[PDB]
PDB file of C-alpha atoms and ligand atoms in Angstrom:
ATOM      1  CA  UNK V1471      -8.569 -29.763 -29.214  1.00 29.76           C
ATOM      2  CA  UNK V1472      -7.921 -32.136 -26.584  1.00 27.69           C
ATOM      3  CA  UNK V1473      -5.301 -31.884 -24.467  1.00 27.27           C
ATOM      4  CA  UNK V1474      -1.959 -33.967 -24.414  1.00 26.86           C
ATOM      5  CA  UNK V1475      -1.703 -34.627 -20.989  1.00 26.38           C
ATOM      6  CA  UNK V1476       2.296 -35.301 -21.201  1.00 24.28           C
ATOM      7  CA  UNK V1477       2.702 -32.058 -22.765  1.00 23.35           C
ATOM      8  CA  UNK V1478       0.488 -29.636 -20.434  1.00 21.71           C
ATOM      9  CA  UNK V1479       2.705 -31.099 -17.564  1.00 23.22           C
ATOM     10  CA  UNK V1480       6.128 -30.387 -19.614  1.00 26.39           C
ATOM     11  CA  UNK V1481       4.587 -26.961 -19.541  1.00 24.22           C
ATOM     12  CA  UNK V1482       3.166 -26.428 -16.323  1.00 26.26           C
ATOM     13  CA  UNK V1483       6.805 -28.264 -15.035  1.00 26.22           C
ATOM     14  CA  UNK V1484       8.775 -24.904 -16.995  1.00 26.14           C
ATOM     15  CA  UNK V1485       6.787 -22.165 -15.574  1.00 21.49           C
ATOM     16  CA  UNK V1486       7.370 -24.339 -12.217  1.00 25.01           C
ATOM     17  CA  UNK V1487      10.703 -24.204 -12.676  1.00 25.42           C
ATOM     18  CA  UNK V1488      10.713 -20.270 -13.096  1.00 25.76           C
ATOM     19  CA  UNK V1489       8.766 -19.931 -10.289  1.00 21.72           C
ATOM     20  CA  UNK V1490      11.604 -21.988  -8.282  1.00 19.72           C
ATOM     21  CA  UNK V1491      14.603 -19.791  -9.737  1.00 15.43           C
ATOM     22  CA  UNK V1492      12.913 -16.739  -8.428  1.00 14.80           C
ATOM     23  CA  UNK V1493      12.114 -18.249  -5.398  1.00 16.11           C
ATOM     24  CA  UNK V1494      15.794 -19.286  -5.041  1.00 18.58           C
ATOM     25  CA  UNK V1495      17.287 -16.125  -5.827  1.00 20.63           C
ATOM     26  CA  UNK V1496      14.972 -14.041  -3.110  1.00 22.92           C
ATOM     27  CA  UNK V1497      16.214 -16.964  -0.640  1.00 22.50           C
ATOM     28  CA  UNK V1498      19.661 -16.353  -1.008  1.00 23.21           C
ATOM     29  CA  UNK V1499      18.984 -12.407  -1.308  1.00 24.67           C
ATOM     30  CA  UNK V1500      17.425 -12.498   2.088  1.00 27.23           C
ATOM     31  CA  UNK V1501      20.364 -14.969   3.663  1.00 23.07           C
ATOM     32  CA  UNK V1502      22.585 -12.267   2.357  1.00 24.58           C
ATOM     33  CA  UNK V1503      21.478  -9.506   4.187  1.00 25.85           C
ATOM     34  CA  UNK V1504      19.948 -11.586   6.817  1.00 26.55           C
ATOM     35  CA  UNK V1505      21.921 -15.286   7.595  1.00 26.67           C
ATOM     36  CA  UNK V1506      20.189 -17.436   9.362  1.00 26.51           C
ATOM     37  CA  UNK V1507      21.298 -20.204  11.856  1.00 29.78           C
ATOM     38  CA  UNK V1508      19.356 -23.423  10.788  1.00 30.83           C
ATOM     39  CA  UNK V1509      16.340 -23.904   9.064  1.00 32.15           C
ATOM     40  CA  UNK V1510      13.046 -22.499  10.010  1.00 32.25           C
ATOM     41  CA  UNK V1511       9.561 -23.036  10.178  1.00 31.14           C
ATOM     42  CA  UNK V1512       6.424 -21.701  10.491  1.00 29.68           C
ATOM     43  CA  UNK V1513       2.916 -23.526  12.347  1.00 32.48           C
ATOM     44  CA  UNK V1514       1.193 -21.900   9.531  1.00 29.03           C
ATOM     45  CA  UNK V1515       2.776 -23.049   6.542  1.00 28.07           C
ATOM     46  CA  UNK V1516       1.494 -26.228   4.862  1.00 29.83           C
ATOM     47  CA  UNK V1517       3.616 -29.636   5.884  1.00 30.52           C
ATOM     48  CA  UNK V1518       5.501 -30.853   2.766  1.00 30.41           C
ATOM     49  CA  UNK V1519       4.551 -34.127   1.670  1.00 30.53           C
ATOM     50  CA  UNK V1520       7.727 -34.949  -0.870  1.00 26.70           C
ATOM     51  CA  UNK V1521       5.800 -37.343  -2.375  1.00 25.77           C
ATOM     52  CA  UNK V1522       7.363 -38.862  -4.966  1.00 27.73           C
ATOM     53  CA  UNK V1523       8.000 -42.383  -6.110  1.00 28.60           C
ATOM     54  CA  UNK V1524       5.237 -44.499  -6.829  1.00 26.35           C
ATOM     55  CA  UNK V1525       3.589 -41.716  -9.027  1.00 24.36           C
ATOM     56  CA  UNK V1526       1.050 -42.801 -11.529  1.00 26.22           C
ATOM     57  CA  UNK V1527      -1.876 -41.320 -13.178  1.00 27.69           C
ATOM     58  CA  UNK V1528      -3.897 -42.519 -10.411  1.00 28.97           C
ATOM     59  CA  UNK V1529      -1.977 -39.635  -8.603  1.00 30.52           C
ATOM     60  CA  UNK V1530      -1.793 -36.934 -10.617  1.00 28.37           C
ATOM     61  CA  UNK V1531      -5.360 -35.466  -9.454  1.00 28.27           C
ATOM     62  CA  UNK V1532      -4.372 -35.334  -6.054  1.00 30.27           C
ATOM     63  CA  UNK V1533      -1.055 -33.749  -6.208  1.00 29.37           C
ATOM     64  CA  UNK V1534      -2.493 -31.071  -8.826  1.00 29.82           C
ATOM     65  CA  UNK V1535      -4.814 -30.442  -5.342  1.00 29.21           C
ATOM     66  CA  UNK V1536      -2.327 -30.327  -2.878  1.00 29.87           C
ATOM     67  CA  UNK V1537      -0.074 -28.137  -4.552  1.00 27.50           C
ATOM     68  CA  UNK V1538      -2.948 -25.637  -5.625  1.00 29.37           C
ATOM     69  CA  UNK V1539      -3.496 -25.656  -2.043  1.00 25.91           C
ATOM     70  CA  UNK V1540       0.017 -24.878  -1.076  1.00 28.52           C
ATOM     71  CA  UNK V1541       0.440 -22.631  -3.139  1.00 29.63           C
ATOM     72  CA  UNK V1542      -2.248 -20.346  -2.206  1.00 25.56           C
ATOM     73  CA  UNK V1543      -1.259 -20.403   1.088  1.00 29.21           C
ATOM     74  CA  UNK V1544       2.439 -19.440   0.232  1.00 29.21           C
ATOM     75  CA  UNK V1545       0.707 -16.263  -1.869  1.00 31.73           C
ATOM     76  CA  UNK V1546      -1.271 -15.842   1.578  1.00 33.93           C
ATOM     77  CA  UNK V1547       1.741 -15.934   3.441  1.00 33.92           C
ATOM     78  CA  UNK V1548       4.245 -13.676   0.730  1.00 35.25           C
ATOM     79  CA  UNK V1549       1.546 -11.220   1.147  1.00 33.90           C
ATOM     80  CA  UNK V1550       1.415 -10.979   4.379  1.00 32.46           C
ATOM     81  CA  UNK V1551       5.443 -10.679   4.641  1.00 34.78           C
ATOM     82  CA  UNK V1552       5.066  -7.081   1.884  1.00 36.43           C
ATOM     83  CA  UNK V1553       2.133  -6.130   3.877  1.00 36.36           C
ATOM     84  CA  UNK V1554       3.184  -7.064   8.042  1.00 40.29           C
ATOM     85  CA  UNK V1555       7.015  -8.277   7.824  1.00 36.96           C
ATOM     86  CA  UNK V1556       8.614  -5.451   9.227  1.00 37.00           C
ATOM     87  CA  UNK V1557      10.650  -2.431   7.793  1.00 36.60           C
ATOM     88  CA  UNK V1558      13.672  -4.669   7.981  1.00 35.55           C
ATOM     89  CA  UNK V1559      12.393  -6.267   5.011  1.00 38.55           C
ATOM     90  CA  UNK V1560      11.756  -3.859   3.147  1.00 38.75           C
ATOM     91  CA  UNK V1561      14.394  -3.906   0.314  1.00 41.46           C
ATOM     92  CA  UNK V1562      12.969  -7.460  -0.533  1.00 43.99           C
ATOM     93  CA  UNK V1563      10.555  -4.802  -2.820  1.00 43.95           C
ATOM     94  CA  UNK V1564       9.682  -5.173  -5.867  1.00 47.02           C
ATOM     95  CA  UNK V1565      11.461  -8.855  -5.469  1.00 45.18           C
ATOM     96  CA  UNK V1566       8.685 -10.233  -3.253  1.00 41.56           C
ATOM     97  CA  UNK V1567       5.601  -8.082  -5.049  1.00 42.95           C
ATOM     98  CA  UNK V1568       6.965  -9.835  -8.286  1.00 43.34           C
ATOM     99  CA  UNK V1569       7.635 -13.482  -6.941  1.00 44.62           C
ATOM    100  CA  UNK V1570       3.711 -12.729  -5.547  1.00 45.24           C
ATOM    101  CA  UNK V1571       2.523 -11.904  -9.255  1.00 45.36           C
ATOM    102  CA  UNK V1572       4.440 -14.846 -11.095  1.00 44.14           C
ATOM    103  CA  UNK V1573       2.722 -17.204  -8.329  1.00 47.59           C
ATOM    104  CA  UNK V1574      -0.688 -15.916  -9.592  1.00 49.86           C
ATOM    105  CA  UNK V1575       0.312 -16.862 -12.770  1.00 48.26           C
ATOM    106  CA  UNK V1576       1.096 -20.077 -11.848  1.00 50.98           C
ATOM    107  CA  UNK V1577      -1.706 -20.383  -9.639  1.00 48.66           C
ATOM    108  CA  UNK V1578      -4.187 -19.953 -13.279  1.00 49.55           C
ATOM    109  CA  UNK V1579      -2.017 -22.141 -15.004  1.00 52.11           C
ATOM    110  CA  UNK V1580      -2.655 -25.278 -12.734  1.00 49.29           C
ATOM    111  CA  UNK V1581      -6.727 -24.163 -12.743  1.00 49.50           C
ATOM    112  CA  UNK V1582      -6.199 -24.069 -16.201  1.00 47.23           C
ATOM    113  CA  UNK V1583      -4.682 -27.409 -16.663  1.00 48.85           C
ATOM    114  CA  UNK V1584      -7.455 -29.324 -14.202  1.00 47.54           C
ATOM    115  CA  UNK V1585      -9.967 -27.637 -16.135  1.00 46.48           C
ATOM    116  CA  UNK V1586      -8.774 -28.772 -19.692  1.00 43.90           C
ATOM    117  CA  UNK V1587      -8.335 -32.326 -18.321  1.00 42.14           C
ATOM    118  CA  UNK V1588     -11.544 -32.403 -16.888  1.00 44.13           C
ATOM    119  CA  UNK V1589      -9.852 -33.392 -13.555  1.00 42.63           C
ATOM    120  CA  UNK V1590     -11.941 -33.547 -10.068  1.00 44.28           C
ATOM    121  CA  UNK V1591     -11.558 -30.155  -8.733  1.00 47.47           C
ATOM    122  CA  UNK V1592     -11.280 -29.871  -4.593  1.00 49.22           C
ATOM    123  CA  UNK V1593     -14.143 -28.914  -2.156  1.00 49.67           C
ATOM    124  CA  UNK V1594     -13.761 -24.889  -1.054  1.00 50.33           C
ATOM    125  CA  UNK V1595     -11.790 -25.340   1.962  1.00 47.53           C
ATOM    126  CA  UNK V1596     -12.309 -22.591   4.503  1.00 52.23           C
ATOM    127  CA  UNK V1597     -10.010 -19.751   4.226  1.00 51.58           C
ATOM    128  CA  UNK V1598      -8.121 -19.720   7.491  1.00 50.80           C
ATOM    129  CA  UNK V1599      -8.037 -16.729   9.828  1.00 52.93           C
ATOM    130  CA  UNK V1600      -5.667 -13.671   9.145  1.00 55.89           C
ATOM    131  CA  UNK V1601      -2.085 -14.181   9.867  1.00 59.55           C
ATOM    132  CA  UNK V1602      -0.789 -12.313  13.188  1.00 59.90           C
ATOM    133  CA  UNK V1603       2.079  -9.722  13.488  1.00 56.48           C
ATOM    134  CA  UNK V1604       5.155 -10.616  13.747  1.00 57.51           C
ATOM    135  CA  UNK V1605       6.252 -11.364  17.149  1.00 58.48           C
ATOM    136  CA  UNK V1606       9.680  -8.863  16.660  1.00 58.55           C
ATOM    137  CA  UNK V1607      11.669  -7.703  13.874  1.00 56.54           C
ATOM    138  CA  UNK V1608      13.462 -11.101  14.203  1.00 55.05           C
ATOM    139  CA  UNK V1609      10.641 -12.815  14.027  1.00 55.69           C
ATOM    140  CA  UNK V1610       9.472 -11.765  10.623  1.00 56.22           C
ATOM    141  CA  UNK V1611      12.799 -12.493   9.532  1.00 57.77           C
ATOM    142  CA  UNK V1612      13.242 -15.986  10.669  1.00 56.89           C
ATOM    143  CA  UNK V1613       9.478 -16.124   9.109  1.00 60.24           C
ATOM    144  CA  UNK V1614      11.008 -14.574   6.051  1.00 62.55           C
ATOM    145  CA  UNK V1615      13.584 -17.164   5.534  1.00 62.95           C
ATOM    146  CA  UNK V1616      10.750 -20.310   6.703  1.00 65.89           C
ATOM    147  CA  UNK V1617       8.089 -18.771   3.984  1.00 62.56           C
ATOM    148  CA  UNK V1618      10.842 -18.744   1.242  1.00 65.97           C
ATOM    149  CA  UNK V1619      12.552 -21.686   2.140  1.00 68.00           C
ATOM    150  CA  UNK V1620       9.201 -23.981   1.917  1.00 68.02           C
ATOM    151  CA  UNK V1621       7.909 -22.538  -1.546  1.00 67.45           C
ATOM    152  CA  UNK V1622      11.356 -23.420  -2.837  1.00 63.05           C
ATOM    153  CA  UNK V1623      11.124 -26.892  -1.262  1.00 63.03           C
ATOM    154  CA  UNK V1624       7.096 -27.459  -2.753  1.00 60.60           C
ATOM    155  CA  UNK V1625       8.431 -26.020  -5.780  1.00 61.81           C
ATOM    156  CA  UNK V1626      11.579 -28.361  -5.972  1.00 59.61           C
ATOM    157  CA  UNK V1627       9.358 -31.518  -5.213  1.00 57.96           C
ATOM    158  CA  UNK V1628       6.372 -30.259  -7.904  1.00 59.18           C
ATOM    159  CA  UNK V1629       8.716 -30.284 -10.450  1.00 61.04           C
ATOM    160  CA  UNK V1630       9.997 -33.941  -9.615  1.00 59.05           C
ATOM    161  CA  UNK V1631       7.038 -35.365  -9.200  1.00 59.82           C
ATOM    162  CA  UNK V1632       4.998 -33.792 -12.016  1.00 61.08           C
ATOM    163  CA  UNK V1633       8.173 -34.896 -14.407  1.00 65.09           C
ATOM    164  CA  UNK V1634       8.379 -38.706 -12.803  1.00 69.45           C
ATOM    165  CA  UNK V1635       4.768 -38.879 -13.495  1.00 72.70           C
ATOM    166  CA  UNK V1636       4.840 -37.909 -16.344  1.00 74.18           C
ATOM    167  CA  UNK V1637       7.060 -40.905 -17.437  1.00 77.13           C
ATOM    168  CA  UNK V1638       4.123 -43.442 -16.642  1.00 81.43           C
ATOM    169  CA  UNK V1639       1.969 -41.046 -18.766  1.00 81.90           C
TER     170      UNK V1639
HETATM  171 CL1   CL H 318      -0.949 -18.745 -16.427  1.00 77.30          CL
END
């Protein structure tokens, strides 16, 4: 029947949450065989907003958008690690093919939940161009750890602001 709005989020928050486990395991995987000196970044990742704090249901439309958004362009950018990282990361197989699957899955979930709350659903945004090479082998890495790194950090801040809205729900 209709949906309970507190309880698609408690759901949506616990497949979040797996998501972020897996993503924190590869993370420290990588740093294992690979440690890395200070964070990184990449110009082609989405900027995290951490918004959270002032989170009603006036928001939740929006950040539902924005983190469909980011997440698509994490899958974009875990693909392109399996498919263009290097062969230095190649024992991050089946790790990274899997973490790309369970992203898909949460990927439907959040379509899934707009569509069931009859929630505005964003504009087509154009896909942006492919992703280049690496620039060297330690450039994919330092990618490696930046790609990682943010989808634990949109993950992290999804689940705290899905949850703190939630509370005004
Ligand atoms: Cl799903």
């Amino acid at each position: 029947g209709s949906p309970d709005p507190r309880a698609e989020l408690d759901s949506t928050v616990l497949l979040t949450r797996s998501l972020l486990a897996d993503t924190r395991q590869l993370a420290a995987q990588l740093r294992d065989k690979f440690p890395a000196d200070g964070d990184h970044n990449l110009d082609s990742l989405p900027t995290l907003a951490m918004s959270a704090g002032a989170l009603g249901a006036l928001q939740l439309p929006g950040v539902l958008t924005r983190l469909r958004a980011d997440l698509l362009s994490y899958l974009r950018h875990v693909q392109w690690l399996r498919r263009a990282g290097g062969s230095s990361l190649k024992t991050l197989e089946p790790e990274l093919g899997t973490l790309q699957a369970r992203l898909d899955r949460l990927l439907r979930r959040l379509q899934l939940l707009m569509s069931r709350l009859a929630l505005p659903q964003p504009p087509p945004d154009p896909p942006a161009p492919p992703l280049a090479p690496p620039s060297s082998a330690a450039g994919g890495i330092r990618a490696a750890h930046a790609i990682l790194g943010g989808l634990h950090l949109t993950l992290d801040w999804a689940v705290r602001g899905l949850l703190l809205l939630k509370t005004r729900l």
